[PDB]
């Protein structure tokens, strides 16, 4: 965490960078400091460009503005201002640290216009600006991949070797891929800018009166908003200073229940908003209403703005965050060896210098396929089309590969695992001092007062809507209710008072006037006559509240006079029901050892009840609640574990999560290893948990749906959103259907791509390597394949097999075994090496057999490589290799358990049959395609049969080798050095806890 400030020289840096033509890689390589050191022209006090190390390197421009001089710079969305008192840069969010609550109250009156302008210059606009970049900026940024440079180099070489057509094909593929990539990245950025964009007309008072109306962009910390009496979105973070409000903080917690926010308690002591969260209004949370009760209107002082807000922090984290397929040493050394051999043999076979350089250069492109990434991505396009045919839409197809190697899934509770709302579980009538049994549906009850109160008392508020829907009494004196008995009309009513949570309604029917009161259990019970209220109201209430349910008391009297004397008629209990398809999906994931986690902003009781109900915690598995008391400053923090009714499971809280992260880093891995429920998580805490789990060498996905869990979706390896707005922007995947079933299906698809990818990769490597050998063989005798032969190997054979081996789909079920997670694994390397030993054996045997014939005459090596054709050695080697490409393409691909069996994709097998038919025709049928392809038309039938026998030997050898390797290599590996002790951090932690569970 250090920095420095740098101040004609740009022209020299530009010339040196442009002249080198590769120094950008060196600057982009491990040593980038020199590139900045020369260009920046090296103090902090006096600078025009700043560099910071994060102990990592980052470069920023020292922006400036006039007020009468200001110097500021942005970094990770956070602004910093230069201060002359200490001659250093300071984060603006800490400019006023530990402000007293009385100091906040002193700004009850607004902010002077001069103070508004100067303070706006300090903090900046209230908007959250997404720096959308122009097409060249994205190009230099997200399309600097060195493989594209290698592709361009190969293209230029091929145009320098008259190999126009394949160069054109690669150019079209690469250009189209680059253009689509740039377009979609810009589209995502534009959509993000739109999502985070906010615009409102907000009233702000002034010490000179006449409360003005301004844009949201003008707010600065220190003026106060006049919150509207009706409601609307909150432009920024603020602290209530006068009045009370009801807010909808579904953007932070994920629940839509109204939340009461009261005025800030005046006094000394700093205002943090971590302990004054009940008196502060956060950005984005929807205000249901604001009632003052004192003075002419509700007042809330601004505290944070722009990126400083909680939403600002979340968006900042969102903005600012196979792999082994790019192994370098082996391919580089092998290409180098082949090159030096080529120059040696070529100078041994006298040919011109320009030809020698071109030939030596082309072997590297033969070794490394420039078409490899396109072959890799075909299967991801197949998987994307498959998913889009069934709801799920993806933006980055290569991310689908991560679904194959996913091993941990986090789930939001509200909306994702459970319905996005509450539903009636039943009404609980009580006659004397004993509740009658809970009724499943309230329809089946007498025509007594209780049903009438269930049908009439309401503000007609999803809660009352659900009440009236279940009882079924249709609406039509403020109303007249029809049962599906008597028509009951509402004679009088009262508003639902926000302070005292009571709601009374007086009704009468053709058959005395009677009042019904709906309210909270304890308060209404206190209002009622203890004669009717039962003794065990406290235990029946802890029984429901502790189980995550929400109870409502109904009282009545046959008619201050109305809300006085009351008697309880019953209790209505509500629950956030599990969606009908979560338990099968959760158990399906669990039986394959895919860990399911709950990560909720809800309370802990509802979270644990839902976790037990849906099957994340089996009835036989233990479960422990870990609680961490805050450091009192007299004694340090200490963890305390409370078991419950009963693989171990841990239920961590929100503040306790932060406490464990801060004061117990050493014990955090153990908790994360066996934690299943995470309640009261802040939007940033979800991302923190995801990042920590990823640090434990996991591949974590999450299936959130709401706005609160967006940073976690961005941070997760495989994020899925169950909502077409507020979360599809960041998620790589989005499902039209809203339930957990998208998670398993995605995994299955991912496994195919992670399996298909391996096979495709294997073929391409082989494709390349065998070709390299063949080229070398001909180069040993001053000969080359030929332009048409090269084209018939690169265009038709590779494209057909590569695209057609990716059609296969999953096996409709999830097995217990994951696919291999690494292309550099022992099985992959062994398979390629053994397959090449076989292929080289067959090719060399064919070459050494064709020399021992009565009818063979060697080529004359005095002529160039392409002018030696048609030629006996070339046609023999080409005939063998052409079949070998198909043999390997067929043998490499696999079926079960991650894909359908290899005989299902009839197009691929039919393509192989036609390609093999034309190839055997080329070998046997004389002079039909041997004009274009310079072949010498072997006349001896017996030798042709021997060639056919050799390629059949290659066929049977490759298939038997793949079968025996797959069915007997794990046994040999395990039987040797059985002490595996896998290096992944989470597996190691499981072993330490398994031998000795640390929490006794």
Ligand X SMILES: CCCCCCCC(=O)OC[C@H](COP(=O)(O)O[C@@H]1[C@H](O)[C@H](OP(=O)(O)O)[C@H](O)[C@H](OP(=O)(O)O)[C@H]1O)OC(=O)CCCCCCC
Ligand Y SMILES: CCCCCCCCCCCCO[C@@H]1O[C@H](CO)[C@@H](O[C@H]2O[C@H](CO)[C@@H](O)[C@H](O)[C@H]2O)[C@H](O)[C@H]1O
Ligand Z SMILES: CC(C)CCC[C@@H](C)[C@H]1CC[C@H]2[C@@H]3CC=C4C[C@@H](OC(=O)CCC(=O)O)CC[C@]4(C)[C@H]3CC[C@]12C
Ligand U SMILES: CCCCCCCCCCCCCC
Ligand V SMILES: [NH3+]CCC[NH2+]CCCC[NH2+]CCC[NH3+]
Give the interface with Mg ion as residue ranges (CB under 5 A).
254, 412, 414-415, 705-706
- 23 interacts with ligand U by CB under 6 A: no
What is the rounded distance in angstroms from the CA atom of residue 399 to the CA atom of residue 891? Answer: 27
Query: What are residue 981's phi and psi, to 5 degrees?
Result: 55, 65
Q: CB 766: neighbour CB atoms within 10 A?
A: 23
> For ligand V, which residue of 516, 698, 790, 885 counts as binding (CB under 6 A)?
790
**With contact defined as beta carbons under 8 Å apart, do 643 and 623 qualify?**
yes
Q: How far is the CB of 820 from ligand CCCCCCCCCC (least distance, A)?
A: 19
Q: Does position 171 bind ligand Z by CB under 6 A?
A: yes
Nearest residue (beta carbon) to ligand NAG = 860
CA neighbours closer than 13 Å in the CB half-sphere of residue 348: 10
The window from 392-400, 625-633, 799-807, 947-955 that contacts ligand Z (CB under 6 A) reads 799-807
Hey, which residues between 783 and 802 contact ligand U (CB under 6 A)? 788, 792, 796
**633-to-630, 636, 873 alpha-carbon distances in Å:** 9, 7, 87
Told to check if 948 binds ligand CCCCCCCCCC by CB under 6 A, we report yes
The span from the CA of 405 to the CA of 821, in Å, is 7
What would the x/- binding string for ligand Y be over residues 124 to 153, using CB under 6 A? ------------------x-----------
Question: For ligand CLR, what does the binding mask look like between residues 398 and 427, x meaning CB under 6 A?
Answer: ------------------------------
| 144 interacts with ligand Z by CB under 6 A | no
Residue 684 burial (10 A CB sphere; 0-12, 13-18, 19+): middle
| In contact, 525 and 539? CB cutoff 8 Å | no
Containing 775, the helix (H) or strand (E) segment is: helix 742-779
The CB-of-825 to ligand X minimum distance in angstroms stands at: 4
Sole binder of ligand X in the list 973, 985, 988, 990 (CB under 6 A): 973
- Kind plus residue range of the DSSP H or E element containing 75: strand 70-75
φ and ψ at residue 435, rounded to 5 degrees:
-65, 135
CA pair distance 467, 272, nearest whole angstrom: 40
CB of 899 to ligand X, least distance (A): 18
- At a CB cut-off of 8 Å and minimum separation 6, what does 988 contact? 981, 982
Is residue 331 a contact point for ligand X (CB under 6 A)? Answer: no
């395990």: which residue's tokens? Answer: 974
Three-state SS at 202 = strand
Q: Work out what residue 371 binds among ligand NAG, ligand CCCCCCCCCC, ligand U, none; the CB cut-off runs from 5 to 8 Å by kind.
A: none
Q: Judged by CB under 6 A, does residue 826 bind ligand X? A: yes
Q: Any known ligand binding at 705?
A: yes
The conformation of residue 885, written as its DSSP 8-state character, comes to H
Nearer to ligand NAG, 674 or 868 (CB): 868
Question: What is the x/- site pattern for ligand Y, positions 178-197, by CB under 6 A?
Answer: --xx---x------------
600: its two tokens: 């909720």
Nearer to ligand V, 740 or 793 (CB): 793
499 binds, among ligand U, ligand X, ligand NAG, none (CB under 5 to 8 A by kind): none
Alpha carbons 143 and 306: distance in angstroms, whole number: 31
Any contact of residue 796 with ligand Z (CB under 6 A)? yes
Minimum gap (Å) between residue 869 Cβ and ligand NAG: 13
Q: Which residues pair with 734 in a beta bridge?
A: 393, 721
Among 7, 14, 22, 644, binds ligand CLR (CB under 6 A): 22
Site of tokens 């009724």: 439
Report the site for ligand CLR in 340-369 (rule: CB under 6 A): 361, 364, 368
Going by C-alpha positions, the residue among 668, 594, 101, 158 that lies closest to residue 365 is: 158
Strand, helix or coil for residue 506: strand
- What single-letter DSSP state applies at residue 282? P
Residue 440 CB, nearest distance to ligand CCCCCCCCCC (Å)? 48
Helix, strand, coil abundance in the chain, percent, nearest 5: 45, 15, 40
3-class SS of residue 718:
strand
Pairwise CA distance, residues 177 & 181, whole Å? 6
The reply on whether position 149 binds ligand CLR by CB under 6 A is: yes
Q: How near is the Cβ of 887 to ligand CCCCCCCCCC at its closest, in Å?
A: 5
**Contacting residues for 426 by C-beta, under 8 A, at least 6 apart:** 438, 439, 440, 441, 442, 572, 573
928 binds, among ligand Z, ligand V, ligand X, none (CB under 5 to 8 A by kind): none
Alpha helices, DSSP H only, in 389-484? 449-456, 462-471
Q: For residue 152, state whether it binds ligand V (rule: CB under 6 A).
A: no
Say if residue 46 is exposed, middle or buried (CB neighbours under 10 Å; 0-12, 13-18, 19+).
Answer: exposed
Catalytic residue positions? 412
Instruction: Give 89 or 883: the residue with its C-beta nearer to ligand CCCCCCCCCC.
Output: 883
Q: Which residue has the tokens 């990818």?
A: 757
What is the DSSP secondary structure assignment for residue 244, as one 8-state letter? E
805, 900 contact by CB (below 8 A) = no
Q: Which of 19, 268, 328, 928 binds ligand CLR (CB under 6 A)?
A: 328
Least distance to ligand NAG, CB of residue 857, Å: 10
Residues lying near ligand NAG in the complex (CB under 6 A) are found at 860, 862-863
Instruction: Return the number of the residue (414 or 800) whose C-beta is nearest ligand U.
Output: 800
Q: Does 781 bind ligand CCCCCCCCCC (CB under 6 A)?
A: no
Binding mask 379-408 for ligand Y (x = CB under 6 A): -----------------xxx----------
**CB of 238 within 8 A of CB of 264?**
no
Tell me the per-residue interface mask from 656 to 695 with ligand CCCCCCCCCC, x by CB under 6 A, - otherwise. ----------------------------------------
Count interface residues toward ligand Y (CB under 6 A): 18
Of ligand CLR, ligand Y, ligand NAG, none, which one sits near residue 860, judging by CB under 5 to 8 A according to partner kind?
ligand NAG
Between 586 and 792, CB nearer to ligand U: 792
- Owner of token pair 């011109």: 352
932 binds ligand U (CB under 6 A): yes
Q: Which residue has the tokens 């399996």?
A: 755
Q: Residue 377 interacts with ligand Z (CB under 6 A)?
A: no
Question: CB 227: neighbour CB atoms within 10 A?
Answer: 26
Q: Residues 332, 497, 638, 825: which binds ligand CLR (CB under 6 A)? A: 332
With contacts defined by CB under 6 A, how many residues of the chain interact with ligand U? 6
- 3-class SS letters over 886-949: HHHHHHHCCCCCCCCCCCCCHHHHHHHHHHHHHHHHHHHCCCCCCCCCCCCCCCCHHHHHHHHH
- Return d(Cα 352, Cα 252) in angstroms, integer: 73
User: Containing H/E element for 169?
Assistant: helix 164-196
According to the binding rule CB under 6 A, does residue 871 interact with ligand Y? Answer: no
CB of 895 to ligand CLR, least distance (A): 6
Spatial CA neighbour of 263 closest among 271, 253, 255: 271
First to last CA, the chain: 40
Instruction: Please report, as ranges, the residues that interact with ligand X according to CB under 6 A.
Output: 820-822, 825-826, 973, 976-977, 980, 982-983
Instruction: Please report, as ranges, the residues that interact with ligand Y according to CB under 6 A.
Output: 142, 173, 177, 180-181, 185, 371, 373-375, 377-378, 396-398, 798-799, 802
Instruction: Please report, as ranges, the residues that interact with ligand Z according to CB under 6 A.
Output: 134-136, 148, 151-152, 155, 169, 171, 173-175, 178-179, 378, 381-382, 385-386, 389, 791-792, 795-796, 799-800, 803, 807, 907
Instruction: Please report, as ranges, the residues that interact with ligand U according to CB under 6 A.
Output: 788, 792, 796, 918, 929, 932
Instruction: Please report, as ranges, the residues that interact with ligand CLR according to CB under 6 A.
Output: 22, 25, 146-147, 149-150, 153, 169, 172-173, 176, 326, 328, 331-332, 335-336, 361, 364, 368, 381, 890, 895, 901-903, 909, 912-913, 916-917
Binding positions for Mg(2+) are 705, 709
Binding positions are 705, 709
């Amino acid at each position: 965490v250090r920095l420095s400030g740098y101040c004609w020289r740009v022209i020299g840096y530009h010339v040196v960078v442009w002249m080198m033509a590769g120094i950008p890689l060196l600057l982009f390589r491990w040593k980038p400091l020199w590139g900045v050191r020369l260009r920046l022209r090296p103090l902090a006090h006096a600078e025009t460009l700043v560099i910071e190390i994060r102990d990592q390197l980052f470069t920023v421009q020292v922006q400036t503005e006039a007020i009468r001089v200001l110097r500021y710079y942005l970094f990770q969305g956070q602004r910093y201002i230069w201060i002359e008192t200490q001659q250093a840069f300071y984060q603006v969010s800490l400019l006023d640290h530990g402000r007293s609550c009385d100091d906040v109250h002193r700004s009850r009156h607004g902010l002077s216009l001069q103070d508004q302008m100067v303070r706006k210059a300090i903090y900046g606009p209230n908007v959250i600006s997404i720096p959308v970049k122009s097409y060249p900026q994205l190009l230099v940024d997200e399309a600097l991949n060195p493989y594209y440079g290698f592709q361009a180099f190969s293209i230029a070489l091929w145009l320098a070797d008259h190999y126009y057509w394949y160069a054109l094909c690669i150019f079209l593929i690469s250009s189209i891929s680059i253009c689509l990539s740039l377009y979609k990245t810009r589209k995502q950025s534009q959509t993000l800018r739109d999502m985070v964009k906010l615009s409102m007309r907000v009233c702000v008072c002034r010490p000179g009166g006449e409360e003005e109306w301004v844009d949201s962009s003008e707010l600065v910390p220190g003026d106060c908003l006049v919150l509207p009496q009706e409601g609307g979105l909150m432009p920024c973070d603020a602290a209530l200073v006068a009045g009370e409000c009801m807010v909808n903080e579904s953007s932070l917690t994920g629940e839509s229940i109204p939340v009461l926010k009261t005025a800030l308690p005046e006094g000394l002591g700093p205002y943090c908003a971590e302990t004054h969260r009940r008196h502060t209004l956060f950005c984005g949370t929807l205000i249901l209403q604001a009632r003052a009760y004192v003075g002419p209107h509700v007042l809330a002082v601004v505290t944070r703005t722009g990126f400083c807000t909680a939403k600002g922090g979340l968006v900042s984290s969102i903005l600012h965050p196979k792999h082994s397929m790019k192994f370098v040493a082996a391919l580089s050394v092998l290409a180098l060896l082949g090159t030096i051999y080529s120059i040696f043999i070529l100078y041994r076979n006298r040919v011109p210098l320009n030809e020698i350089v071109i030939r030596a250069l082309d072997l590297v492109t033969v070794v490394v396929p420039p078409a490899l990434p396109a072959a890799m991505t075909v299967c991801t396009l197949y998987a994307q089309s498959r998913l889009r045919r069934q709801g799920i839409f993806c933006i980055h197809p290569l991310r689908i590969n991560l679904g194959g190697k996913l091993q941990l899934v986090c789930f939001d509770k509200t909306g994702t695992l459970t319905e996005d709302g509450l539903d009636v579980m039943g009404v609980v009538p009580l006659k004397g001092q004993a509740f009658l049994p809970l009724v499943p549906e309230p329809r089946r009850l007498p025509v007594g007062p209780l049903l009438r109160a269930l049908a009439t008392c309401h503000a007609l508020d999803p809660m009352d809507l659900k009440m009236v829907e279940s009882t079924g009494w249709v609406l039509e004196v403020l109303a007249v209710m029809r049962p599906p008995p008597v028509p009951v009309s509402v004679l009088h009513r009262f508003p639902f008072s926000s302070a005292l949570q009571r709601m009374s309604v007086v009704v009468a029917w053709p058959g005395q006037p009677e009042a019904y009161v709906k309210g909270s259990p304890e308060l209404v019970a206190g209002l009622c006559n203890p004669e009717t209220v039962p003794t065990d109201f406290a235990q029946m209430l802890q029984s429901y509240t502790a189980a995550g349910y929400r109870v409502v008391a109904l009282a009545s009297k046959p008619l201050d006079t109305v809300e006085g004397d009351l008697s309880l008629l019953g209790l209505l209990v509500m629950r956030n029901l599990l969606k009908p398809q979560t338990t099968p999906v959760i158990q399906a994931l669990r039986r394959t050892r895919i860990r399911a986690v709950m990560v909720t902003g809800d309370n802990l009781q509802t979270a644990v009840t839902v976790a037990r109900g849906c099957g994340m915690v089996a009835p036989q598995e233990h479960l422990i609640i870990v609680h961490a008391t805050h450091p009192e400053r007299g004694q340090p923090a200490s963890l305390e574990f409370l078991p419950m009714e009963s693989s171990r499971h841990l239920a961590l809280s929100g503040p306790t999560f932060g406490i464990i992260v801060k004061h117990f880093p050493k014990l955090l891995p153990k908790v994360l290893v066996q934690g299943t429920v995470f309640a009261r998580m802040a939007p940033e805490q979800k991302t923190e948990l995801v990042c920590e789990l990823q640090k434990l060498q996991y591949c974590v996905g999450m299936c959130g749906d709401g706005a609160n869990d967006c940073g976690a979706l961005k941070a997760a390896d495989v994020g899925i959103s169950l909502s077409q707005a507020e979360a599809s922007v960041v998620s790589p995947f989005t499902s039209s259907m809203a339930s957990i079933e998208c998670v398993p299906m995605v995994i299955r698809e991912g496994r195919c791509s992670l399996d298909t990818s391996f096979s495709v990769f294997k073929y391409m490597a082989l494709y390349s390597l065998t070709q390299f050998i063949s080229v070398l063989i001909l180069y040993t005798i001053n000969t080359n394949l030929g332009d048409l032969q090269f084209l018939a190997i690169d265009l038709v054979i590779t494209t057909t097999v590569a695209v057609l081996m990716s059609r296969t789909g999953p096996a409709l079920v999830l097995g217990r075994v994951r696919p291999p997670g690494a292309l550099l694994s022992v099985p992959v390397l062994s398979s390629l090496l053994l397959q090449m030993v076989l292929v080289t054996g067959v090719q060399l045997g064919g070459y050494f057999l064709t020399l021992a014939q009565p009818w063979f005459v060697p080529l004359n090596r005095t002529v160039a490589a392409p002018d030696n054709l048609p030629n006996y050695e070339n046609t023999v080697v080409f005939s063998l290799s052409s079949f070998q490409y198909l043999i390997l393409a067929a043998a490499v691909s696999k079926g079960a358990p991650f894909r359908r069996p290899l005989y299902t994709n009839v197009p691929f097998l039919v393509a192989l049959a036609l390609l093999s038919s034309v190839l055997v025709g080329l070998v046997l049928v004389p002079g039909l395609l041997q004009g274009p392809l310079a072949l010498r038309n072997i006349t001896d039938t017996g030798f042709k049969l021997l060639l056919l026998g050799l390629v059949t030997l290659n066929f049977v050898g490759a298939f038997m080798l793949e079968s025996v390797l797959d069915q007997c290599l794990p046994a040999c590996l395990r039987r040797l050095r059985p002490k595996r002790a896998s290096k992944k951090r989470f597996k190691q932690l499981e072993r330490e806890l398994a031998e000795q569970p640390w929490p006794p």
